[PDB]
Amino acid sequence: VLNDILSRLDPPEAEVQIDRLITGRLQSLQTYVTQQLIRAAEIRASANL
Amino acid sequence: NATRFASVYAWNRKRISNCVADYSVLYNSASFSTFKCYGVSPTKLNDL
Amino acid sequence: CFTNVYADSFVIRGDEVRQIAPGQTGKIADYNYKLPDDFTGCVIAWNSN
């Protein structure tokens, strides 16, 4: 929970913690986007058919 | 400010509950040479 | 090569030398002299007893 990290740590290490969280969530978003892109290619092929 | 302290092998444990903890008295005191908080920042303890 | 150098000089007690650093708390940092969290530069301190 980002709010807990902001409420429990000062910026010097809150920045590291939020950096880890941001990296994880960005990786999840990129994975989801790639999955969506591949499935959209599938659906485009089916739509052309 | 206990008169006697326990030996390290027999460290004493005191339970704190149902009270208001004004941590300023601790972190504004000059009587401490080491004050290191892990997982928390002492200023924010006043809000926790 | 630097933009413009600044030398801040003063005197403290040994126990408070730790307070002259980014992200520190205590009497000196809060009320006397506070470095920025992203401070760039050098701190030099020596005994003057």
Q: What is the DSSP string of B9-37?
A: GG-------SS---THHHHT-SS-S----
**Of the candidates A1, A7, C25, C23, the residue with the CA atom closest to the CA atom of residue B48:** A7
CA distances from B32 to A18, B28, C2, C9 (A): 31, 9, 39, 26
Residue in this structure with the two tokens 């403290």, named with its chain if needed:
C12
List, in sequence order, the alpha helices (H) in C1-49: 27
Q: In units of Å, what resolution does this entry have? A: 4.8
CA distances from C19 to A17, A32, B40, C28 (A): 24, 46, 18, 6
CA distances from A39 to A26, A28, A36, C35 (A): 20, 17, 5, 52
Other C-beta atoms lying within 10 Å of the C-beta of residue B41: 19
Give dist(CA B16, CA A30) in Å, integer. 47
**Of the candidates C15, C14, C16, the residue with the CA atom closest to the CA atom of residue C48:** C14
Other C-beta atoms lying within 10 Å of the C-beta of residue A9: 19
Give dist(CA A8, CA B40) in Å, integer. 5
**Of the candidates A21, C20, A5, the residue with the CA atom closest to the CA atom of residue B40:** A5
- The set of residues, in sequence order, having a beta carbon less than 8 Å from that of B5 and lying 6+ positions away, is B12
With an 8 Å Cβ cutoff, is A11 touching chain C?
A: yes
Contacting subunits of B (3+ beta carbon pairs below 8 A):
A, C
CA distances from B8 to B5, C8, C21 (A): 9, 44, 33
Give dist(CA C42, CA C2) in Å, integer. 13
- Find the CB nearest C15 among B27, B33, B43: B33
Query: Using a CB-CB distance cutoff of 8 angstroms, which residues of chain C are in contact with residue B27?
Result: 25
